[PDB]
Design a protein around this ligand. Structure first.
Ligand SMILES: NCc1ccc(C(=O)CS)cc1
Ligand SMILES: [K+]
Ligand SMILES: [K+]
Ligand SMILES: [Zn+2]
Length: 624
C-alpha cells in the first residue's frame, strides 16, 4: 500500500455565518480554501490520491448521534435566517447555515472516505480537508463549530466495518474535544489523547472533565488522556515533551491498529484562540512521530486552525510529512516550561496506575517554513551482491577521481600500511554517499555494509564534519569504544550495549524490546531533538527491530541518516533500507512494561542528562 489520500471538496466552503456573532467570527469558509490552495501552491495536493467526497448515510450518522439530534439538524436546510439564529442559540459556540447540514454530511463522508482509503490499503495514509469540524460535537448537541463528530465517526467506522480492536485518536487541536472523550470515555478499544488550552478550566469549553484527572470510566479507564495547558505560549519544546513523555510511550505500548488525528491547527503560532507559539513545522514531526504506528495508517482530519497563514503552513507541513518528505529541522529546543512540566507530571502520575511506564519512586510574525530528494536512499552492499531494492533506491558506487584522491590522502595521513582494496572501496563509497546526501541534495539517507568498523566510522564521522555538518548524532549498537571524540560538543553518542560524559548516553538494556522502545521515546528522541544534529550516523556490528528507531530518528537532520553495517545480513540490510526509504514499519506489537532494572537504568540516565538536555525533563525541577 502506497499513496497519500487527500479528500476535499469546495462545497464545504458553501456555508458561513449569516449574522453577527463574535464567538464564531473566526470560523470562516476561507480556511478550507486557503488550506487547499496552500497544498496546490507547493505541489502537495498534486502528489496526493484525490479520493472523492461523499455524504455520510443516516445509519453512519447515528453511529455517534441520536435520532432526535439528527432529525433536529435535518431541518436546518429549510430555515430562514431568524429560524437559523434561534436554532443556533440552542447550542454552545455554533452557528447554522442552510447548507451546513449538507456540508456536515460531506465532512463525515470525507472522513469515512479517508478511513476506507487507508484501511482498504488503497493508500498508506491520508488527510481530510473538511468543514465543519467534529471533535466538539456530541451525541445530541452541536458544539464549538461542530455539527457532527467526524473523528468519532471514523473510529466507530473502523471498529465496525474493519473489526479493529485498538484505534488511537490524537487531538492536537488547541481546544479539548469533549465529544470524542464522551464518545469513547468507557470504550477501551479507542485510546483518546488530547492536549488543550485549559488555563485551570477558565478557557472554553470550561469543563472539569478536560483536566488530567479524567482518565476514562470503568473498562475505558486509562484510555482517556487529557493534557491541559494552564498557560498560553506553549512552544515546540512543550509539544515535543508532551509527545515524548506522554503520548508516544502509551501509544507504542498500546500498538494501535489505526491512527486518527484531529488535526486542528489553532495550536499553532499566530492563532487567535490557542495563543501558543508552536511553529507550523512541528506538525510535520508530530505527524512523523506517529507514522511508525499502525503500519503508517494515519487518517488526519482537519479541525480548528483560524490564523489563515499558520493554517496553510501547518497543513503544508502535515501533508509534506504524510508524503514522506524530509522533516524540517527544529532549532532552539529545550526544556518545557514549568507549567507544561506540571501538566505532564500530573497526567503521567494519574495515568501511571494504568500505564505502568509512568510509575515513579517516592521522593505576530514568524519566519516562513523552509521548502521541504530524487533518490531517497542509496545502498552499497558488499561488492558483488545484488538485491531487490525499492523504487527509490540506487546502488551508488560511482566513485569519482577526486573521491579516490581524498581516500588516498586519508590513508597516507592516518591509516598507513592499510592496502586492502575492499575496505578502501567501502571508504570511497562512504565519502561519495556523504557528499551526495550532505551537499548534492540528491540523496536523503543511505546505508553501507562495511567490515572494518574502526577505520570506517573514523572516515565517515570526520568527513561529515569536514563537509558542512555542525553536529552529528552517532547511534551505535553494540559494545566496544568507538573512535569518537565525545568532548568537542559537536558530536553526541548513543551506545546501545550489553555491559561519565554529558555528551554520551550508554544503555545496557524478551522485554528488551519494550525497554529499548521506552528509552527511544523518552531518552533517545528528546536528546536527539534538542541536539539538532546535521547528520545521523547509524552503526551496527556483529533480534532487534530497529526500523522503528531508524524511522523516528529520521525526524532529525532533515532525514539525513547514514547507516554503517558491520558484516552482511540480508535481513537486517533489507530492514535498514526499508526504514530509510520511507516504507511502512511492521508494528512492534503490544509492548508490556519493561523490567525494573531497565527502568532504573533509564531513570538514572534521565537524571544524569536532565540538567543539560532539559527536554528529558518530564517533571518539575526542584530548587536546590
Ligand atoms: N469562542 C468559542 C469557541 C468555540 C470553539 C472554538 C474552536 O476552535 C473549535 S475547534 C473556538 C472558540
Ligand atoms: K485537543
Ligand atoms: K477512550
Ligand atoms: Zn480548536
Amino acid at each position: 500500500a502506497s499513496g497519500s489520500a487527500l479528500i476535499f471538496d469546495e462545497e464545504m466552503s458553501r456555508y458561513k455565518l449569516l449574522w453577527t456573532d463574535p464567538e464564531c467570527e473566526i470560523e470562516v469558509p476561507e480556511r478550507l480554501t486557503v488550506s487547499y490552495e496552500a497544498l496546490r501552491t507547493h505541489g502537495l495536493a498534486q502528489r496526493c490520491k484525490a479520493v472523492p467526497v461523499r455524504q455520510a448515510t443516516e445509519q453512519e450518522i447515528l453511529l455517534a448521534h441520536s435520532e432526535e439530534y439528527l432529525e433536529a439538524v435535518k431541518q436546518t436546510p429549510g430555515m430562514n435566517v431568524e429560524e437559523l439564529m434561534a436554532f443556533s442559540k440552542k447550542y454552545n459556540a455554533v452557528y447554522f447555515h442552510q447548507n451546513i447540514y449538507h456540508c456536515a454530511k460531506l465532512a463525515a463522508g470525507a472522513t469515512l472516505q479517508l478511513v476506507d482509503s487507508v484501511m482498504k490499503r488503497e493508500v498508506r495514509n491520508g488527510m481530510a480537508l473538511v468543514r465543519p469540524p467534529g471533535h466538539h460535537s456530541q451525541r445530541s448537541a452541536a458544539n464549538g463549530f461542530c455539527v457532527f463528530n467526524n473523528v468519532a465517526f471514523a473510529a466507530l467506522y473502523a471498529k465496525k466495518n474493519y473489526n479493529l480492536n485498538r484505534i488511537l485518536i490524537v487531538d492536537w487541536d488547541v481546544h479539548h474535544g469533549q465529544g470524542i472523550q464522551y464518545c469513547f470515555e468507557e470504550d477501551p478499544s479507542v485510546l483518546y489523547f488530547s492536549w488543550h488550552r485549559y488555563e485551570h478550566q477558565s478557557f472554553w469549553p470550561n469543563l472539569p472533565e478536560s483536566d488530567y484527572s479524567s482518565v476514562g470510566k470503568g473498562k475505558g479507564s486509562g484510555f482517556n488522556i487529557n493534557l491541559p495547558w494552564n498557560k498560553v505560549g506553549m512552544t515546540n519544546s512543550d509539544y515535543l515533551a508532551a509527545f515524548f513523555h506522554v503520548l508516544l510511550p502509551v501509544a507504542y505500548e498500546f500498538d494501535p491498529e489505526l491512527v486518527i488525528v484531529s488535526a486542528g491547527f489553532d495550536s499553532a503560532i499566530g492563532d487567535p484562540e490557542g495563543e501558543m507559539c508552536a511553529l507550523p513545522e512541528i506538525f510535520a514531526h508530530l505527524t512523523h512521530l506517529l507514522m511508525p504506528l499502525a503500519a503508517g495508517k494515519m487518517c488526519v482530519v482537519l479541525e480548528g486552525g483560524y490564523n489563515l497563514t499558520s493554517l496553510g503552513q501547518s497543513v503544508c507541513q502535515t501533508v509534506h510529512s504524510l508524503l514522506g518528505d524530509p522533516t524540517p529541522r527544529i532549532s532552539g529546543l529545550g526544556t518545557a516550561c514549568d507549567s507544561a512540566l506540571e501538566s505532564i507530571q500530573n497526567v503521567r502520575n494519574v495515568q501511571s496506575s494504568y500505564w505502568s511506564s509512568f510509575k515513579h519512586l517516592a521522593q505576530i510574525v514568524w519566519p516562513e517554513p523552509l521548502k521541504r530528494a530524487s533518490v531517497r536512499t542509496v545502498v552499497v552492499p558488499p561488492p558483488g551482491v545484488e538485491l531487490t531494492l525499492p523504487k527509490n533506491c540506487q546502488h551508488s558506487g560511482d566513485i569519482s577521481e577526486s573521491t579516490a584522491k581524498e581516500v588516498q590522502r586519508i590513508r597516507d595521513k592516518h591509516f598507513h600500511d592499510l592496502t586492502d582494496q575492499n575496505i578502501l572501496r567501502s571508504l570511497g563509497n562512504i565519502i561519495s554517499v556523504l557528499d551526495r546526501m550532505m551537499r548534492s541534495d540528491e540523496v536523503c539517507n543511505g546505508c553501507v555494509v562495511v567490515s572494518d568498523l574502526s577505520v570506517s566510522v573514523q572516515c565517515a564521522l570526520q568527513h561529515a564534519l569536514t563537509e558542512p555538518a555542525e553536529r552529528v548524532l552517532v547511534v551505535y549498537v553494540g559494545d566496544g569504544e568507538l573512535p569518537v571524540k565525545t568532548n568537542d560538543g559537536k558530536v553526541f553518542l548513543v551506545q546501545i550495549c550489553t555491559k561519565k560524559c554529558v555528551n554520551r548516553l550508554t544503555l545496557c538494556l524478551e522485554s528488551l524490546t519494550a525497554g529499548f522502545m521506552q528509552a527511544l521515546l523518552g531518552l533517545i528522541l528528546p536528546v536527539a531533538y534538542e541536539f539538532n544534529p546535521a547528520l545521523v550516523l547509524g552503526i551496527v556490528e556483529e533480534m532487534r527491530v530497529w526500523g522503528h528507531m531508524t524511522c523516528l530518528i529520521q525526524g532529525l537532520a532533515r532525514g539525513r541518516m547514514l547507516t554503517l553495517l558491520q558484516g552482511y545480513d540480508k535481513d537486517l540490510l533489507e530492514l535498514t533500507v526499508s526504514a530509510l526509504s520511507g516504507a511502512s514499519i511492521s508494528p512492534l506489537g503490544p509492548l508490556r512494561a519493561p523490567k525494573p532494572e531497565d527502568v532504573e537504568m533509564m531513570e538514572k540516565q534521565r537524571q544524569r542528562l536532565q540538567e543539560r538536555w532539559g527536554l528529558l525533563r518530564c517533571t518539575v525541577s526542584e530548587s536546590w
